[PDB]
Each structure stands twice: as C-alpha cells, then as structure tokens.
Assembly symmetry: C2
Homo-oligomer: 755 residues x 2
C-alpha cells in the first residue's frame, strides 16, 4: 500500500483511489462531491468556474449531458466537455457523465424499449439483461459511464405516478429484475467494468414507492422487518450479488427520518451489513431538502453536514449545499475525514469504470449502435414477450386476418406513440395504428382511423411533432369528446372489427416534480375521462371488438372488464410496440405476459398486493366484491396449459438444506405457446406473522401442442426463512407449504417440514 501508484492500471480501483486521494488537497477532493446539470458546464466552462470556483479543480459528475444532441453530436459534445474538466484537474480526473437508462437511454435517437413495468410482464430476465446490455452500449459510446437506473422500488400503491418505473409489487420479481438490469448495464461482477458498460445507481433507497396516499414525496410507514423482507431485498441483491457501483437515496422520510439523513440505512445497513464500496448519490437537490422540505436540518449548512455524515457521497444538484463543505471543514464545523471518505468512493468508482484509462466517447460507434437493426428487433421481441392477455371471453382473439374486411382503429392512444416517463421527446416509434396499417397492407384488409376521444387536451392524432414542453397538461374537454365519440360511432358503422386503444398517458401518470404544483398521482384507478363512454358506445354496435390498454400505472378498468370480451394490456410497449400488438392481435405471436402487480377492483380497496399477512385481507368490504380484478401473476394464452402438483424431492429437510421442487406443465391446446410457471411458499408458523404466500421462483416455458415438460426449482434457507429487524436470516423448524401454478390463485400445493 506504501508502493501503491494511481497510474498503475494493474492495481484495484480502491487502491488507485486511495493512492490518488493521498495526493489531493481538501478543495480538490471536495470538488469530486458535486454533480450539477451538465448544460451550463458544457456551454461556458470558464463562466461556470467563475460562478462556482470549485470547478478550478474538476468536478464529481454532471447530469444529462445528452441535451438535444443525436448520437454522434452527443459523443463529441461530451469529449469537448471532458477535455475542459480534465484540463482543470492536476491529475486529469474526468467527470462522471450521468444519464437516465430506465428503459433505454434517455437521449435523442436512442432505442426506446418497453417501459420497466411492461418488461416486468414478460418474466424473461434473460431478455432484460440483453435490453440493458444494449442500453449500456448506446450510453457508453455517447460518453455516459453511469446512470441513475434501475428503479427497484416496490409498487404497492398504483396511485403513485411513478409506478410504471418499477418492476411491480413482488420482491422476488423486483429482485431478479434488479440483478438482470445491473448485470446488463455493468456487465457481470468484476474488478473493472468491461468496455461499453456503465455504472448503475439503484434507486430509490429505500421505501420510496410506499408513500402514503400514493402521493409523490409523501412519508412511508415501513416497519423494520417489512423493510428487510419487502423493500430491501432488491437492493441487497443489486449491491451484494450483482455489484452495482452506485446507489441513489429517496426523497421521502420514514418515521420522521429523511432517507438522505438516514444513518441506519445509508451506513449501518448499506456499508456495514452489506459491505457496499461504491458511491451514494443524492436525488435532485435532496440534501438541501433535509432543511428546506423535511425541516430536520436547521440550515443549508447543517443539511450538507447531515447528509455527508449519514453517507451521501455526491450531491446531485445545481448550486448544491455541498459547495459549502470546504469552508465548513476550514471553519471547524465538519471533520475533513468525511470529505475524504466520500471523495475516495467517487474516485474508486471512476477508476473501476475506466475513466482514467479510456477515451471519453466514440462518436462513430455511437452512430452505428443507436436504434440499430439488432436493437430495434430486441425492442420488438421484448414487447411480444410482455403484452398481457387479460381476458378473452369466447375466444374473440386471435383475429383471423383472412376474415377481416375493414378495421376501425380508434381511441386516444391509437395514433400516438406512448413510451412512458424518462423517454426522449418527441417520442419516436410505431403507434398501434401504424402497426395495424402495416399489417393490413400485407394481409389485404382496410384500416380506418378515428380519434374516439382525447385523454388530455391537445394530445390528439399524431405524436411525431414535439408537443409544447413546459406547458401544463389539461384534461380533455368532455363536450368535444362526446362529439368525437359520435364521429367514431358513425365511422364504425361499416367496420367489421373495432380495435380500441385506451388507458392513460404520460400526463395522467407521471412523476410529480418538486416545483410549483406539479401533479402525477391519481385518486382513482378507472380509465380517466370519457374513454368508458366511448368503449360502451362502440361495443353497443355488436361488432367484433377488442381493447388494447396503453398506460403507465396499473389501471383498474372495471367498466371495460365487464363489457369488453377481449383485452390486451400493453402498458407502454416501446418504440416497436405497434408491430407487436398487431402480431399478437392476429395470433402470429401467442401472448405470454403475466401481470407483475395485483389489479384491485377500485382504489378504495388499496392495498391489494398479493402477499398479505393472514389478517391483511381477512375481512371484505360491505356490499362490494373484494376479490382482485386480476391477481398477481395473471395472464392468458391462445392455448391452454395443464399443471401437475408440485413435487418436493424430500418431505423433510434440515434448517440449512436446499430442496428441489418440480412441476409438470403440458400444452393442452391447439397452438404453441409460453406459460410462466410460478412457485410460491407459505411459512405456516413463524416467530413473526408472514404472508399467506410469497413468490420464490418462476420459469417461462415454450411448449408445442401436446408437449409436456418438468420444470425444476431449487429453494434454500434464504427462501424458507425471513430476516429479522437487524437483517439476520431466521430459519425455524416447522411446516412450509409449497405452491405452484400459472398465477397466484390457480395453485396446487405440497407440504414439507423443516427440522
């Protein structure tokens, strides 16, 4: 360690970081803890230094350097900025260049895969890794070596406008997805990142999705055992198994403790229990908000101090409160060892991502990868694996294209592309209307379009031209909608097939920003506005009619589910989604998605997530069907599947043993198809009450007609036990019920005993 040299590429990132940090002044180390927006650094670095003198020593990171630039211009703009940063540091430390990679890179010209919750419907973690390996390549070639993704929050409240960012309600699903995403973006765990990979910052640590009322920023009520067995597991796997380099903290509070000042979470759990060696980044301006919003720090200075000592390493903010850290050290108010501790984490991450050893970006590579043929094909395939068949009464689907003459494609989400939050605007891709038009051209039937109704005012017809940004969204006028509905009814008279494209859009489910009176959470889970009136008016014509749901949050479409026989749930299907919808509507693709959330019947029945305690849904609501509209794991096929009971290899095992379980699944229908075999356990008696069922595995299987297969699962003590308030795994003797089936309701079971 005495001989350690930071210029030695054969040394580990942590040892190069320590050797470099020993050469640095207080001001140089403190500059590494700032991450403003890139825009003002890129446009006038000399003026940025004038306004923010720390920039004489370089910078920790910048956020969103893509700006409005296409792939090659983005790469060149980052190279130019990096040269400005590296020229200011005595040691040539480049900036981290942070972007969003929720479902593809948030940058002009980049491939837009289906939204996270859409992809969660696929139950194909292998394809999730591919999607984010492709995202990483696009990001890194354009100069970004880190991102503020994945969102591995748990969606327990679909009122939340950010639900679409999550992989659903289930800890197992969110955990498996977390690992696939981190390995996709970073590569498999290694001392150094492979080339063409980027650092992840798993967010938001921890409990952000449990905000009361589904209101963004609102406190979460999470007990310590609930924290350990529901909310933390995806983070623990992302950190301790897949090796995520970064982590982002949560806006919110738990029991009065803001996450950005939560030493128990940010230090005791993350550093001591889990051994995290990467960086903790704040969410936007959330260190200041320990004071300005939560009222826990008495000033900006004290907020800076609380966040740093709690364990936040780098502040994502313009003119952040971390700009005060050098003077607070020099004034005696803050121990310099906390500046050094954070800067050493940042530096080791920068070494591990190759910043010191590699070019800044690769403009020509960036141009080849962006929306490449291979990446668009992947986005199409992901959508084909994700779309969920909710119901198909009377086998209306698949449509037979030879028997179609004139199809009406109608609805607020027919002609527009819908990509979800964190997508480059304007949206680029294949709307449902365009997918069906292109399919009709090949198949030889006619397609007619009608608006039907609007969801938000001004969002009608095409989505190709960039809609007025920063303009506040307004609900669509009901009177105009009823005239649009009558127009659609009239146009439908000579159509033999109606395809209604309904749901929500990026204005009715969205992140409610801190500024002003920004809104994005809903107090109702039905289809908003006049869409139900539209669907009823079309369904009354007695035509062959189906619905395709395009939307962000999980929706509870009761009127539609009651009156429309066939419903496809596509969430946001990505830039190739329209082709995938057409292929599924006509049975060229057999739908195979399953719901990664429970769909409750109405918002007054929340919470409805499937892993309730024995008392959680013990009592039902008066005069009201209290069953879910669709249970977790639900999804139909154009074929049928028969299941045998789960078979354990032994009837009894020791507290530390593993156990093999097998399930026989057979295609009992007419068409090749995929089903998702799902494995659940119940810990019958426990030292703390446990859910009535908890998913511990799943497996999507392709089966030809009449084909039968034995699907194998392996469970261990990490599956049969639970973690206590301190994170220690308890395995206790007694009965475990083991359940398997095609969803969380149609289960068969066997029982084993732990001894």
């Amino acid at each position: 360690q005495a001989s350690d040299d930071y210029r030695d590429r054969s040394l580990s990132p942590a040892r190069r970081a320590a050797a470099l940090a020993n050469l640095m002044t207080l001001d140089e180390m403190a500059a590494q803890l700032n991450c403003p927006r890139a825009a003002d650094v890129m446009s006038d670095p000399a003026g940025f230094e004038a306004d923010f003198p720390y920039f004489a020593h370089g910078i920790g990171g910048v956020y969103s350097a893509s700006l409005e630039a296409g792939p090659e211009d983005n790469a060149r703009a980052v190279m130019a900025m990096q040269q400005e940063v590296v020229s200011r540091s005595r040691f040539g430390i480049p900036a981290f260049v942070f972007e969003e990679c929720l479902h593809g890179l948030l940058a002009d010209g980049a491939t837009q895969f289906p939204q996270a919750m859409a992809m969660a419907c696929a139950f194909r973690p292998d394809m999730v890794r591919q999607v984010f390996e492709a995202t990483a390549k696009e990001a890194r070639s354009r100069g970004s070596q880190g991102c503020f993704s994945p969102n591995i929050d748990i969606c327990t409240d679909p009122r939340w406008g950010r639900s679409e960012e999550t992989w659903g309600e289930d800890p197992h699903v969110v955990t498996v997805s977390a690992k696939a995403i981190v390995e996709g973006l970073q590569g498999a765990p290694a001392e150094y990142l492979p080339a063409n990979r980027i650092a992840t910052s798993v967010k938001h640590f921890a409990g952000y999705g449990q905000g009361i009322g589904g209101r963004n920023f609102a406190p979460s009520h999470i007990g310590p055992v609930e924290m350990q067995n529901v909310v933390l597991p995806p983070f623990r796997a992302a950190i301790t198994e897949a090796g995520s380099i970064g982590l982002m903290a949560s806006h919110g509070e738990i029991d009065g403790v803001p996450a950005h000042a939560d030493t128990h979470l940010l230090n005791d759990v993350l550093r001591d229990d889990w051994g995290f060696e990467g960086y903790v980044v704040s969410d936007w301006d959330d260190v200041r908000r320990i004071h300005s919003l939560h009222g826990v720090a008495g000033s900006e200075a004290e907020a800076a101090i609380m966040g740093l000592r709690a364990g936040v390493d780098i502040e994502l903010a313009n003119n952040g409160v971390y700009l005060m850290l050098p003077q607070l050290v020099r004034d005696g108010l803050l121990e310099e060892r906390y500046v050094r501790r954070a800067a050493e984490r940042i530096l080791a991450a920068k070494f591990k991502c190759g910043l010191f050893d590699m070019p800044f970006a690769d403009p020509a590579l960036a141009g080849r990868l962006a929306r490449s043929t291979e990446h668009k094909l992947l986005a199409r395939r992901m959508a084909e694996e994700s779309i969920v068949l909710l119901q198909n009464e009377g086998n209306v689907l698949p449509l037979q294209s030879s028997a179609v003459r004139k199809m009406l494609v109608v609805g607020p989400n027919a002609a527009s592309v819908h990509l979800g939050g964190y997508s480059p605007k304007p949206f680029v891709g294949v709307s449902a209307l365009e997918g069906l038009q292109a399919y009709a051209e090949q198949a030889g039937f006619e397609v007619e379009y009608a608006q039907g109704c609007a969801i938000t005012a001004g969002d009608e017809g095409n989505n190709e031209i960039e809609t007025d940004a920063s303009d506040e969204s307004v609900q669509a006028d009901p009177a105009r909608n009823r005239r649009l509905i009558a127009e659609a009814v009239a146009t439908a008279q000579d159509c033999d097939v109606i395809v209604m494209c309904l749901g929500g859009n990026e204005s009715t489910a969205r992140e409610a920003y801190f500024a002003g009176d920004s809104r994005g959470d809903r107090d109702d889970l039905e289809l908003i506005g006049e869409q139900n009136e539209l669907a009823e008016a079309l369904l009354a014509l007695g035509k062959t009619t189906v619905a395709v749901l395009i939307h962000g949050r999980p929706l509870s479409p009761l009127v539609l589910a009651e009156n429309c026989p066939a419903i496809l749930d596509a969430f946001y299907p990505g830039e190739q989604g329209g082709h995938a919808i057409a292929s599924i509507l006509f049975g060229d693709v057999n739908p195979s998605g399953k719901l990664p959330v429970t769909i409750v019947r109405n918002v007054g029945q929340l919470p409805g997530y499937y892993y309730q305690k024995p008392t959680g849904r013990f009592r039902n609501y008066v005069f009201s069907d209290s069953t879910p509209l669709y249970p977790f794991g639900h999804g139909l096929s154009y074929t049928s599947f028969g299941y045998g009971a789960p078979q354990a290899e032994r009837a009894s095992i020791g507290l530390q043993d593993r156990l093999r379980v097998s399930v026989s699944v057979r295609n009992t229908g007419d068409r090749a198809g995929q089903d998702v075999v799902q494995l659940y356990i119940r810990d019958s008696i426990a030292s703390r009450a446990r859910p009535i069922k908890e998913m511990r595995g799943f497996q999507k299987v392709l089966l030809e007609p009449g084909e039968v297969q034995v699907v194998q699962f392996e469970l261990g003590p990490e599956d049969f036990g639970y973690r206590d308030a301190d994170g220690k795994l308890l395995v206790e003797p007694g009965e475990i019920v083991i359940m398997a089936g095609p969803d969380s309701q149609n289960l068969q079971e066997t029982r084993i005993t732990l001894v």
Copy 2:
C-alpha cells in the same frame, strides 16, 4: 407490603390486600381468576358450567355481558344470583368481575343511549363527556356491572373502517382529552378505591387498532416507534398514568408481524415499566388463541396461552379459552408459576379497588330509578344539541322559521327509524328525526308528512321500534324499488314548502366486521351508499326550501350532497333524544356548535387525509382532482359569526422547560348568541425528526352574546412543544415554534416564539 397485611382489612390498599390474599391461594385458585367467558352459560347453569370447566370450582375471573335481554331490576337480580354462585365456590368469597359495554351508555335493555362516541367528539365539551359517563357508570354499577370494555381510544385515521364511529376522531389531543374525561366519569377522579356507583374502565384497543391497512378490520397496522409514541399512545398514556384507568384491552392486530396480544414491548416495557401500570390487561375476544389460529405466530394453543401470559395479558376474554391450560402447563413444567401469580394478583387488586369484596353485588331498585331517568334523558338531549355540526349553510337557509312553515316533508332512509350506532341495545329506543319534527310541528302550528324516499338496506324501512333478529345477514336495498320510492316522495313533495332529507348510513353499512364467517362492515367508498344521492337530487330539483340531516356511523364524504344541497347538518348518531335536538337546531332554538373531529376527504382515493400531515404528507396533489379536504378538521358553522384575533404569547422567548401563556380574542360579530370552539395548534419548525405542519394542543368552547368579546387563555409547556423519541423520552429542542389559533384547522392566525 408487610407480613401483618390482612386481605380482610378494608383500611389497607387494594394492592396490599391482593398480595395478602394471593399468598393464601393455590395454583388452581389463582389460575381461575384469569378466565372471563361469556356470562350466559355460567348464569343459566352454574353446576353444568363447573362440570364442563372444572376451574369454576374455585370461582372465576370475570364474565362478559350478563345483562342479556333483562331490564334494569331483573338485570341486577340476575347478577346477584350469579355472584352468589360464584362467591359460594371461592374459598375466600372472591366475586366475579361483571364486564359490560359502555361505549355511549350502558349496552343493556332500558339503559340511556347517549350520542355515539364520534358524535360526542363533535361537541368539544369534555365537561359534559365526564357527566355522560358518570351517568353511564351509575346505571352500570346499579345493575351489577363493575367493569367495562370502554372507552375505545383508537385513532381514526382511516374512515373506511367500520368501527370509526366508536372513536373520538383523528386528533391525538382530542382523543387524549376525551379519554381522560371518560375514565374520570366512569371511574371517578383517581383514588385508592373507586367511589360507590363507579366502574372500572378497560381502555382499548392497545395499540394502533385504528390504523389497519385498507380500513379493513383485523388488518395489520404500519406504525413506526416515533409515530406510535406521538400519535397512537398519548391517549393510552393519559388514561393510564393520569386518569388511573384500572384496566386495558389489547388489539386484534399486528404491527410488523407482532400480534399486539403477544407484544412484550407494548404490554410490558411501555405499559408496565415506562408507565407504571398496576391494573389488568384483558384480551379482546378470543384473541389469545388467535396468536396461533389467526396470526400463525404461536405453534399451538398451549404456546399461545404462554406467549400471551408472558407478554403481559392477565385475563383472557374467551369461551373455553386457552388460559384454561395454564395450571396443567405449570404442573407439566412448561410455564413458571410466577406468571400465573403476577396475573392473578393484578386481577385481585383491581377487584379490591372496585369494592367487590366490601359491597353488595347490585341494587335492583336504584337500577330502576336510574335507567333512562329524566335527568339522564335530558343530558342525552343536551349532548346532542352540543354535538350536531352545521357543515354548510349556503344563503342562510337555516334556521327555518316555525311560524313561516306550513307543510314540511320529512323524507329519507334515516327519518322514521332511530339510529344509535354500534354497541347499543336492540331494538333501538329513542326519538327519530321524524318523531322529533312531528312533536315540534304540533307545538308550532304546521303540518308534517313523511316519505321513505329510499332504503339503504333491504327490510330496513319505516320505524325502528319492533324487534328483528341479527341472524339475517344484511342485504343492500333494491335499486328499482328505491326508484319507485323516489318517485313517490317527489309526488308527496309537490305540496310541501320545506323538505328535510334524512340521509347517511346505518348500523349495517358501518359496523364491526366480526371474526366468524364473512362478516363485513368496512367500505371501499365514502359517498352516500346506494340511491340516496339520486333521491336528494330529485327533491332538490323541485326548488323548494331543502335541507339535509346526515345520520351515520363513519365519517362520510357526501360530495354530490355538498355540491347541490345548500344546508347540511351532520348528526352522526345523535343518541336517543336526537330527534328533538335536530328539530331544535333546524328552527333556531339551539344555535349549532358542533365541530368536526376528523378531516373529511373528498373521496376515498385521497386517503389518508388527517390534518396533522408531515411537511411531505400532502406536499403533492392529485392530477385533475381537487385535493383539498371537503371539510377540514375542526370545521363547524353557526347561525351567528365570530371574529378572531391573532394568538398572543406572553413572551417572545422562553426556556426549554418553561410554560407559556397564550391568549386569543374571539368576538360574536353577528346578531344572536352562539358558541364557537377556539382552537390552538403548534408547528415545531425544525426538529430532530420531521414533525407535522400543525398539531392541536388546546381548545375551548365559548358562549358569546351578540357583540360580546372573550379573551380565551391557553397555557403550553414542554409536553406540548417537544415530542417523544422512539423510547418515549420527551425531547425539547431549541428553536422556533409557530403558535396558531382560529375556529378550525384552516382558518388560523399565528405568532412565533423561540425556545432557548
């Protein structure tokens, strides 16, 4: 505690008499004091009961619900006979605790039915609350009951909960103030022994029962330790450590996987060690067994008994309970006898304190004089007059003028029926809205007609006087029949110049969802159920003078009615004299002065909406939806008007341990006398843990003549300005406190002080 202590010495303290007695008792005799089955089988056949349950050879801890279907004198005599059977079996003559329900009066045939608990919370008259429960205790003790499973001091944060009406609202200060007045009314002011004609309280449900997710009865609550210390516990802490509640009952539910009936931290560390409780912990009905059979935490019934007893449950409320295994478990070596002795001694000390050893069992003739006495009926009338809330009075439709009315239509599902709420004797006995208005018309010289309007539940139409069984599960009223009933009321209304709509919910749409079968009582919607809005809009379209009176259990969010009907009274369940109090307020003889003790959200999708949000709790609003409350906490109008000055603190800066005087002037700026509730709130601007944007710390109902001014005085201190950490330690921190005052939680002026 001395060796000379003698359990027969009435000059000794209850605790010392209980120790002296316990030293004389066997394991089996002490264990028998830990059982509390339902009274009926003990009373009907005591020899058969002892045959079925051998511990009864040594007496019994308690019985539950001995009133049965008997009136006051027969009640008192039936308990005397049963107590003689009990006392004759105990080697030492230990009588039974006789536990009844006293939620809003004694749940027994012929007892005075006061307004429901949430209704009475609207009155902001804790002095009258104390009187109401003094009257209730008299009626209970004279009939042989010396303990009750009351008050319910849960916090109503989720109005979907079918038991909302049993609580005193959402605010910790209000529920704390109410809890102390109830305990001091039922038990008397804290004393070594209960005075005559008082009974023991068992404050329930410990702790967090109201926070069950989904508003679903029995469902887990998610409560952090600081929230628990500053929201849920303060009423229990005040009841236990200040008012001296002798008993306490635990909760059905779990927090973070820990059943409350097995929560050693709650039942021992906080209740025994931190607070110094010396009374008894009684289980809720069969909840010790359910540690095993519902929660899945105990591996067996024997393990459940052990968990409950060691956690700190002293007496099991159950038939054929798991505590019947306690003697054999001690003898088998699976349980230390000292836990049986710890529990039985608490029970015995409570019995001494309640005078069971030194008093007659009951008093049949006094029981007959007290039951629904003229003084108690008048108190029930006056309480309703103080509780009914004027929600809105657009254009000053109220008060009606009696001399100006000719023909009034009284219409709606809650007009002709009496509604008293859960935990009331059936069939209900009282003055319905219709009857109250008919009697007012007779004296006033105008006509009244009645129409059903619509039904809420099928078979519940017309008056509520003749008895029907509770074994017919309730079904919702038929919409087509209701539409015909709406048309009929429309026709009847054509000749009426005034329409009074009696709407809301009933004891079937808000009720306790019981354990057995598929019992239901919680709602996933807060609007008026069924066709009541249809009925209301049909009558409003006629253009006559129309007012609405709301009669219901849970807080309701009647958006349609709030938008379309200009004058709304909220009566909750106004007790057995409620019909008269409603009529008196409709015509101006009483100026309404109730205030809401909960926040009323616009719709169930905006829950939670309780006012004391953290700064982030309602930081963001719902897309395309008015996210303000429909009515804020503390809201209530008047037939006069009140002008408020700003709160004035006596000092701008005080020390951490100082008390502070604050005054608020209020002036009657209208033309008739009336009451208002002056309300004080604080905000701790900066705190080591984030605190609510405002927290009620005082209130005072005032009565003012036209033009009269009063300067209301409040005093605040460390317990008001600070907050309790996760261990219960009061933290007071230097820095700014905002002090706010006004007639409700939204119409406030403020001043700022500094703690140094």
